[PDB]
């Protein structure tokens, strides 16, 4: 039964309810829910509209004429806004969406991430991994899920943050820390058999220091399944010295046994 009807308090296109079937812990409130990245010191993002590369398309940007598709290598979105099956889910390309300088309309085919959350998610209490996020609907492969949103900080600032549970490297490298300011993505756990992947995306600016992180499903996800991505070795090289992976996959790379084995 529902504890919070929407932890995003109306900030997303859809609500994100919270439940806890495990204990009496309230839904987390030790952070500020924000729907777009914030700054707590000057970031100097290049917002100059004349610095944008942009297309001159007169259609829905599904043709070879689209510069933005070419910047992305090709436009990877199909007619339904899902990544093409051909999309490299292992080493994802940079995506350049259309922007305010393009001649196309706001409803062209190359604007998926900038249109926000469309799928139904739930914040819930897991057995062994704290809070997590799961699907309340079927999510076909290649579907945009949500953005990793948080506080933009420098690499140097990131290295002195006390809590390093929510740091996402963007690459003079910058980092998103979702510890104090974050969205639903801050609750997505690590899975060694993941069903979503993060992808670097450019939308309203093309300052390469500041890609935005978009999660897409990498396979069909069924109702009730926990969402998770592979946090990567720059996370686990450090974290594996303090706790072990509880994802429970027979392919788990960071389990107690896997860690003991490598240390031996």
């Amino acid at each position: 039964k529902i504890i919070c009807r929407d932890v995003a308090r109306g900030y997303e296109n859809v609500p994100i309810p919270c439940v806890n079937g495990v204990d009496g812990e309230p839904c987390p409130e030790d952070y500020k829910y924000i729907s777009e990245n914030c700054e707590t010191s000057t970031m100097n993002i290049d917002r100059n509209i004349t610095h944008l590369q942009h297309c001159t398309c007169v259609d829905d940007c599904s043709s070879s004429n689209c510069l933005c598709g070419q910047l992305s290598i090709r436009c990877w979105y199909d007619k339904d806004g899902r990544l093409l099956q051909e999309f490299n889910k292992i080493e994802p390309p940079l995506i350049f969406e259309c922007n305010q300088a393009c001649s196309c309309w706001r409803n062209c085919k190359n604007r998926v991430v900038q249109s926000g959350i469309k799928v139904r998610l739930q914040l819930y209490r897991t057995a062994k991994m704290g809070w997590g996020v799961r699907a309340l609907q079927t999510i076909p492969q290649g579907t945009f899920i949500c953005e990793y949103v948080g506080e933009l900080i420098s690499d140097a600032e990131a290295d002195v943050r006390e809590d390093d549970s929510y740091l996402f490297d963007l690459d003079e490298v910058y980092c998103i820390d979702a510890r104090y300011y974050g969205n639903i993505s801050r609750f997505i756990n690590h899975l060694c058999d993941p069903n979503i992947i993060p992808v670097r995306v450019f939308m309203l600016h093309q300052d390469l220091r500041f890609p935005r992180i978009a999660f897409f499903s990498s396979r069909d996800i069924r109702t009730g399944e926990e969402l998770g991505f592979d946090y990567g070795d720059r996370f686990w090289d450090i974290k594996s010295k303090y706790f072990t992976c509880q994802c429970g996959s027979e392919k788990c790379k960071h389990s107690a046994e896997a860690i003991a084995l490598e240390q031996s």
């Binding site: 990131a158 990567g232 996370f235 090289d237």
Partner: peptide
């Protein structure tokens, strides 16, 4: 090698 854990693409 950094001081803190970082998730990454």
């Amino acid at each position: 090698t950094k001081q803190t854990a970082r998730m990454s693409t």
